[PDB]
Ligand SMILES: *[C@@H]1O[C@H](CO)[C@@H](O[C@@H]2O[C@H](CO)[C@@H](O[C@@H]3O[C@H](CO[C@H]4O[C@H](CO)[C@@H](O)[C@H](O)[C@@H]4O)[C@@H](O)[C@H](O)[C@@H]3O)[C@H](O)[C@H]2NC(C)=O)[C@H](O)[C@H]1NC(C)=O
Ligand SMILES: OC[C@H]1O[C@@H](n2cnc3c2N=CNC[C@H]3O)C[C@@H]1O
Ligand SMILES: OC[C@H]1O[C@@H](n2cnc3c2N=CNC[C@H]3O)C[C@@H]1O
Ligand SMILES: *[C@@H]1O[C@H](CO)[C@@H](O)[C@H](O)[C@H]1NC(C)=O
Ligand SMILES: *[C@@H]1O[C@H](CO)[C@@H](O)[C@H](O)[C@H]1NC(C)=O
Ligand SMILES: *[C@@H]1O[C@H](CO)[C@@H](O)[C@H](O)[C@H]1NC(C)=O
Ligand SMILES: *[C@@H]1O[C@H](CO)[C@@H](O)[C@H](O)[C@H]1NC(C)=O
Ligand SMILES: *[C@@H]1O[C@H](CO)[C@@H](O)[C@H](O)[C@H]1NC(C)=O
């Protein structure tokens with residue numbers, strides 16, 4: 001009737017037309033699921049409106065250092081903690097478990113040594129033939145140092161404080177992409193000596209499995225170098241040994257916990273190695289994918305993407321599987337366009353990843369800046385592994401609401417949410433990144449369809465076979481319905 | 495043939511396909527324009543590669559406070575300075591001239607008083623009836639304080655410092671959207687008393703025109719309140735008086751400088767006023783658009799959009815022109831979705847703006863987050879006024895390379911670059927925002943086709959009639975050809 005009423009009808013048409021395109025709009029919720037969705041929506045909308053109208057800071061989009069405790073004090077984070085989120089498809093094996101486990105378990109073992117390097121960073125290693133040979137760092141046995149500390153708890157807390165990235169605010173202590181990446185590489189060099197010892201590495205991978213299961217994540221796809229596992233006698237094993245160790249741990253864990261879906265491993269090489277070495281690693285990946293077709297997925301090039309070699313620089317090595325007669329199909333999981341640049345060597349790695357038939361693309365922070373690349377990656381079914389906390393800390397974004405992949409989420413783009421390296425910055429396996437996605441990557445009228453669609457895409461866009469995908473969806477559905485029923489009974493009066 | 499060569503063919507075909515979607519990709523440059531583009535590209539690529547590979551900060555992406563002098567020492571900024579950029583379609587009348595003009599001219603006039611308010615901010619006013627009526631701050635003539643100052647240059651520089659937003663780094667001293675918006679409103683309240691005096695306002699608008707012509711901008715569309723211009727006797731004039739004053743100044747300026755295209759005015763109301771006041775402003779805008787259709791353009795709601803009323807909240811007043819018999823078509827230039835939020839009232843103001851047949855959208859920072867809104871605006875031809883430095887300073891973004899509208903640039907969306915309030919933060923009329931757009935909003939292989947497309951879209955998406963647009967483009971083409979010829983003769987060896 002009224003021109004105002006006709007305008008409002010057209011407004012509802014347009015707004016529904018726009019808001020139905022977000023990822024997860026296809027989700028239909030049962031009444032109990034709607035109860036949980038309303039529970040989450042109330043808190044999220046209260047926070048959004050309090051920040052917007054009272055003109056106060058929106059903590060969910062703040063630095064994870066400052067917002068971590070705040071997140072830990074919200075009811076919705078408890079809901080997400082109890083929620084089974086499916087799979088974490090983008091992880092690195094050396095920083096996916098608590099640093100506290102390394103401090104309280106690994107550095108308590110025999111022959112574990114420490115030393116303060118030239119940069120005032122603690123380094124931990126394992127050497128069975130007495131103190132290790134090094135003059136650039138004065139090595140002291142950790143047992144004697146802990147005994148001499150007097151206060152053992154303070155010593156362990158300091159040991160975690162000199163290793164963790166969250167001891168101070170990374171956005172302040174390392175206020176540049178270069179500085180924070182230097183701190184990240186320093187963290188890895190600190191943990192390299194001790195974490196590559198074979199027993200400690202096996203127990204650390206076991207801890208990765210346990211911690212991700214406890215956070216109600218049932219499936220993982222872990223990137224690992226797989227080689228360099230050493231013993232007290234000095235023996236250094238090849239990548240196949242590491243793959244077999246991971247496989248045995250995973251099979252034992254699956255035997256213990258039937259609710260767990262499992263784990264699969266991707267081989268990661270470095271973006272600054274010689275093309276000869278990268279070709280050697282590609283050949284190793286081909287052999288391991290042949291010999292272990294169900295557990296070994298493929299190959300990936302990791303390391304800081306801006307200052308190191310491009311995908312094209314390794315092109316020969318990456319084309320070696322395809323030039324065979326018959327051609328061999330080696331899957332890829334490229335980190336691509338993890339950069340703030342445009343039309344450079346870094347973000348144009350997206351073209352290489354798409355042309356090399358990559359299974360998934362890590363980050364894709366510059367993907368939105370390339371229209372045809374986005375279209376082609378969506379058409380081919382290449383999902384994007386978005387790691388919001390990783391992208392904030394490692395210098396890509398500062399306000400998480402300004403993340404580059406938010407519009408792609410709002411237009412139903414194939415995406416999964418993962419943590420990259422959770423342990424380095426003291427983050428939960430997937431619930432903290434899920435909370436960040438819920439509070440920063442979707443609109444005010446989006447609470448639970450988004451999270452359930454992320455949980456579904458973590459299985460759909462995994463590397464599992466179709467039969468494995470169906471079985472994994474069955475297990476995840478069992479856990480999800482159990483969680484929904486328990487939460488609703490815990491919140492709904494009777 | 496060669497697998498490497500065939501892959502390279504596919505890769506270059508894909509990259510050409512993707513990079514042709516960018517704004518201005520269809521621009522064809524003459525050989526002289528190619529020389530200028532090569533110079534700009536060399537400078538830009540040097541900066542980009544030095545920042546990326548040597549791991550040093552990319553200064554153009556930093557805060558305008560820190561990067562201002564660095565920009566002032568580049569060759570590309572010199573070229574942009576000499577370049578006629580067309581028009582500035584997003585300006586505000588009280589902050590489109592240098593603060594130095596107010597300090598060195600206006601506060602040297604008679605009847606000008608000053609006071610330090612309770613926030614230690616200098617406020618300037620004009621009172622022809624002795625000391626000003628307000629006693630909350632002791633009003634003293636600027637002449638007396640300048641006399642007692644000792645160093646007059648230091649006194650005037652302190653005036654500019656207490657007035658300007660760029661005296662300190664706003665991203666540090668006001669590290670919140672709300673705090674920096676408070677500083678912006680404080681700046682406006684500082685200059686309100688003196689800038690609304692009729693002679694000073696007239697000369698300030700004249701100075702706006704002069705400064706924008708000096709920076710090779712030939713056309714402007716300025717948003718103004720147009721009402722409240724007062725005299726020494728206390729007479730307060732209506733919006734028609736101020737509009738006619740602007741029109742007379744513009745006609746005189748056009749007569750003096752034939753190379754100038756001209757100026758047109760938009761009526762801006764504040765989005766926190768009463769609905770009755772906004773309705774009366776809409777009626778006044780209708781009357782002024784009827785009486786001065788060639789000089790008066792339309793209406794716009796300005797002011798901080800996050801904590802104030804939405805476009806829907808004013809729906810009655812906004813639908814008043816269309817409900818008449820016959821319906822009246824009042825053009826709109828709504829500031830829309832200048833926010834980091836999603837699926838809230840602020841960014842859903844885009845739906846109201848689109849349904850109200852807005853000519854252009856101011857900022858539209860969250861437009862990319864809404865796909866159907868972007869598509870519908872693209873179909874309807876609604877351009878977006880991108881003000882990069884304003885979006886950085888006022889708290890929307892920190893790294894300009896993470897600007898939300900960069901992907902829309904890369905997919906050829908209708909946009910025009912402007913400055914919002916340049917004089918507020920010591921920015922050149924349009925050259926600085928153009929340099930920021932060049933170095934932050936387009937790829938490494940994009941220098942001059944982008945800038946020429948910006949200049950062309952500035953004329954296509956103006957409010958000028960179809961007959962006036964051809965003549966405006968003729969003037970701009972004359973100036974552009976002179977600029978290209980002179981710059982090439984100054985750089986080309988022959
Ligand atoms: C990424 O995946 C792509 C799709 O699987 C790969 O492209 C495919 O590469 C395979 C193996 O090299 C090609 O299959 C062979 O093609 C040729 C020629 O047959 C075709 O061409 C002739 C004339 O052009 C035509 O008459 C035929 O009907 C075929 O169309 C023969 O040697 C073999 O019989 C065999 O079929 C595919 O043609 C090709 N597909 C496409 C769609 O291009 C690509 O190599 C993969 N890249 C990587 C890095 O793994
Ligand atoms: O296995 C350890 C190595 O992994 C890299 N690495 C670890 N996390 C990431 C890495 N590389 C690239 N992108 C960011 C993030 O996904 C670096 C480290 O030396
Ligand atoms: O006429 C002056 C008033 O205009 C507003 N104003 C001026 N510039 C802007 C404003 N508000 C909204 N968006 C950002 C920017 O474009 C506030 C100021 O008090
Ligand atoms: C703003 O804060 C007050 C108290 O500080 C609170 O009552 C009010 O609900 C808040 N506004 C919103 C929108 O949450
Ligand atoms: C590590 O410890 C040293 C000395 O104990 C201290 O000075 C230094 O700041 C610490 N570094 C980090 C990164 O915690
Ligand atoms: C460390 O944890 C492993 C299991 O991961 C356990 O077997 C071992 O006993 C622990 N070590 C210590 C010293 O408690
Ligand atoms: C990096 O710095 C070196 C010297 O410090 C210089 O020669 C080079 O041109 C710089 N830029 C690069 C490598 O892009
Ligand atoms: C200020 O500018 C006006 C207008 O250009 C000029 O007439 C006047 O002389 C200037 N100086 C003053 C008022 O001191």
Ligand SMILES: *[C@@H]1O[C@H](CO)[C@@H](O)[C@H](O)[C@H]1NC(C)=O
Nearest residue numbers: 614615616652655656657661
């Ligand atoms: C303004 O001046 C006062 C005193 O001269 C000073 O304390 C204050 O910090 C200044 N404020 C700004 C915003 O420059």
Ligand SMILES: *[C@@H]1O[C@H](CO)[C@@H](O)[C@H](O)[C@H]1NC(C)=O
Nearest residue numbers: 007812813816823849850851
């Ligand atoms: C917008 O224009 C269309 C025709 O172009 C008209 O039907 C519609 O009523 C207009 N809406 C408004 C709000 O002016």
Ligand SMILES: [Zn+2]
Nearest residue numbers: 090092362420
């Ligand atoms: Zn990663």
Ligand SMILES: [Zn+2]
Nearest residue numbers: 584586856914
């Ligand atoms: Zn504006």
